[model samples]
Target: SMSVKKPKRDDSKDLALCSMILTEMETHEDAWPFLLPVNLKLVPGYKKVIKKPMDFSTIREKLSSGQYPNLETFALDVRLVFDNCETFNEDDSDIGRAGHNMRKYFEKKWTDTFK
Candidate 1:
C-alpha cells in the first residue's frame, strides 16, 4: 500500500514548497495574471489598483496549508470583477476583459488541480 503525502502546513519548508508551486503558476508568462490575479482584484481600497505581483506571501494561509477551503472566496472576487468589465474605457486597456477572462481560466485551472 502506498502512503499519501498529506500537505504539511506546520512546516515552513512545506509552505515554502507550496508557495513555489503557486509562484510558478503565477509567473508562467501565459497564465500568471489570468490564474492568480489576487492583488489586482483584492487589493484593499482602490487607488488605481496596484499590481502587487504574486510572491511567496500571496498564497493564502489556507492554500499554503493545502486545505483550499477559501478557494471559493478567490473565485467569487474574480467573478464580481469579471461581471463589471464594461465599466472600463477603451483607453483604460484590456484589464477589465483580462480580469474576466483570467477568472474563467483560473476557475478551470483550479478545478482541474483536483483531478
Candidate 2:
C-alpha cells in the first residue's frame, strides 16, 4: 500500500495534465464509442456484463468535481472504459479494435506526461 499522508505533491498541477489527457482522448479517432456511456436500453445485458461502467462523460464529471484522489486514480478510470469496451465487444470487431487503439494512445499519453 502507498503511504501518502497528504498527497500534496504535484496534485494541483495534475489537473491541467489530466484535463489535457481527457481532451485528447475525447478527440482521438477511436474515441467515438467511449465518449459517452453505453445505453443499456439499446444494448441489452450491458449492465449485467459490465459491473462498473465508465465513459468520457463520467470521467469529465469526476475531473470537474475533483472526485479522483490522484492522477493514478484518474488514469484507472480512463483505462476502465477500455476494459469494459473489450468485455462488451469482440476483439476482431470495430468497437473492440477502437478500444485497443485508444488504450495504446492513452498509454502513450500517460508515459509522455508522467514518465
Candidate 3:
C-alpha cells in the first residue's frame, strides 16, 4: 500500500510575521488578537490553542493590570512561527491573501496604539 505524504510548508515567512506579531503584542497588546490569524495557514500542522474569546475591553483591562501571565508565552509562540516561516514559500491563495491583509491590519493597529 502507498502512503500519502503531506505537502511541505511554504517559505511564506509566516513564522517571522508571527514573531513580529508577538513582539508587537507584548509592547502593544491591543493589536495582538487582530494579528493572531495572520499567516496562520503557513504552518500545515499548526492548530491554535483554543480559548474563550475575550472582549476588547476586558483584554485591555487584564493587560493594563498585568494579569495576563501567558502574555510572554503568546509572544514566544509567534516568535517560533516567524523564525521558521522563511523556510517555506508564499501562499498565493485566498487564505494567504487574507493573512497578508490581516497582518497589515494588525501592523496599523499596533502603530495606532503606540501613538
The C-alpha local distance difference test score for the whole of candidate 2 amounts to: 0.92
Mind giving the per-residue lDDT tens digits that candidate 3 earns over 29-76?
A: 333433334344664543343223222344344444655454343333
lDDT of 1 by residue, 1-115 (tens): 2787877544334444444445554664534334534544555543364323332233444465565444454444344544434333232566655555555665576566532
lDDT of each candidate versus the true structure: 0.46, 0.92, 0.42
Q: Please give the lDDT score for candidate 1.
A: 0.46
What is the Cα-based lDDT of residue 90 in candidate 2?
A: 92
Candidate 3 clashing pairs, residues 3+ apart or interchain = 10-88, 10-89, 11-88, 11-89, 12-88, 15-81, 15-82, 16-82
Q: TM-score for all predictions?
A: 0.36, 0.90, 0.31
Over 4 Å off in model 2, which ranges?
A: 1-9
Q: Which candidate is the best by lDDT?
A: 2
Off by over 4 Å in 1: 1-25, 30-62, 65-70, 77-92
Deviation in angstroms for 75 in model 1? 3.2
> Candidates ranked by lDDT, best first?
2, 1, 3
- In terms of TM-score, which candidate is strongest? 2
